[PDB]
Amino acid sequence: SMHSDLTFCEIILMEMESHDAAWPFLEPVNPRLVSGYRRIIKNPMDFSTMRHRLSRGGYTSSEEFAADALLVFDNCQTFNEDDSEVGKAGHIMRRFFESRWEEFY
Numbered sequence: 001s002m003h004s005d006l007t008f009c010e011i012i013l014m015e016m017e018s019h020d021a022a023w024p025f026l027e028p029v030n031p032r033l034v035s036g037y038r039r040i041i042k043n044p045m046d047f048s049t050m051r052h053r054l055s056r057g058g059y060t061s062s063e064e065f066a067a068d069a070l071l072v073f074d075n076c077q078t079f080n081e082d083d084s085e086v087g088k089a090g091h092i093m094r095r096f097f098e099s100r101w102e103e104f105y
């Protein structure tokens with residue numbers, strides 16, 4: 001399971017999930033709601049997947065955790081227009097994540 005040295009990542013993820021702009025990213029992009037997503041996005045990522053991976057020990061290092069966070073935001077900018085509701089949310093969340101990360105790095 002998660003090593004205690006990564007508790008700071010667990011907290012960052014909790015804070016991200018609580019953010020007002022996090023709603024698009026809480027769970028995997030849902031084919032019931034969105035068509036053609038995995039046709040374009042070859043490595044989907046979302047905060048629930050990250051939360052489970054972190055807790056089970058699937059991130060050995062904070063860098064691996066951060067790479068999945070950035071993948072959420074990179075996928076969002078690949079698929080969504082910048083002025084769409086989800087596109088705007090991705091930009092908010094990237095800034096929020098980078099600000100929390102920069103306290104440590």
Ligand SMILES: CC(=O)c1c(C)[nH]c(-c2csc(N3CCNCC3)n2)c1CCC(F)(F)F
Pocket residue numbers: 023024033085
């Ligand atoms: C906040 C916002 O601006 C939204 C936009 C542009 N679209 C949707 C949307 C599309 S489908 C959908 N849901 C509603 C709940 N049950 C299943 C289908 N909601 C939202 C709702 C945000 C949510 F609360 F769900 F996180």
Ligand SMILES: CC(=O)c1c(C)[nH]c(-c2csc(N3CCNCC3)n2)c1CCC(F)(F)F
Pocket residue numbers: 023024025026029033034037076079080086
């Ligand atoms: C294509 C994409 O990247 C998306 C991500 C990462 N999230 C959502 C989304 C929309 S509604 C939604 N949830 C929020 C939680 N309650 C249930 C409904 N999630 C989309 C689809 C955006 C749409 F095409 F619908 F405008």
